[PDB]
């Protein structure tokens, strides 16, 4: 159970996998 996010740290010019809501 996990979303695509692109704002999950400040490392990374696109989206990466995010599990928190």
């Known amino acids: ?3 695509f996010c692109c704002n ?3 490392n990374m010019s696109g989206c990466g ?3 928190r809501f």
């Open 1 to 3: 159970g996990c979303r």
């Open 8 to 10: 999950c740290c400040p």
């Open 17 to 19: 996998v995010c599990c």
